[PDB]
């Protein structure tokens, strides 16, 4: 997260870290045993890890619970990002508390102009690399799909969207791949991809969940 501020310890309770010896991407708990995540995130041996606020400290609310089975998107392209989502199973079922929750599907999707929390242990800088230990969180709006296609020509599916500023300066990054876009209280998106970060006229751009919450809801019913 670039432009961000620090979220406070366990504020964001469904953000997980995805750890292989190391965080390299964020998800999301949506109930006691899957987490959403983006599918370019996808690797074998993840950890999942909950309750984490400081990702190199442990400091007394994590859950770690390897993964079980990984479900990427049957269309997941990785050349153009389109369907950019998996799920991911826990081995065991996580305990459910105030600082680790699940967060709410899309009953329907947000329109440009919503504010939303994007959140992630990714790089802060936008010319420069600095990783933070903690959780960084960015408020930030959905733009309109035709600033977003303007942005990105060629590029923009009906299951992308943008959110953030053309200005620049404030942006989700790398390290920041998989996490929660949450616009009153329901995950939206999933952080997917961007030129750089927080440059000038290229705003992030995020799995558009709600096209996905039928395929999520079926794939938990059977697996
Ligand atoms: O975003 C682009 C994608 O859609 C494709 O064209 O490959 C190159 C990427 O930069
Ligand atoms: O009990 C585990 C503990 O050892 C670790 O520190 O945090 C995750 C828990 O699953
Ligand atoms: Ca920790």
Redesign the pocket.
Known sequence: IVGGYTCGANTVPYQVSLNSGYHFCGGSLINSQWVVSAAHCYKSGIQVRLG????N???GN?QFISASKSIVHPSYNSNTLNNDIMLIKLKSAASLNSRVASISLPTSCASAGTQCLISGWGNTKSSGTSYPDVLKCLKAPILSDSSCKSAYPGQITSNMFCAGYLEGGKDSCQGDSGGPVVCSGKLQGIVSWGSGCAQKNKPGVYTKVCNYVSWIKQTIASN
């Open positions: 984490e606020d400081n990702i400290v442990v400091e994590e």
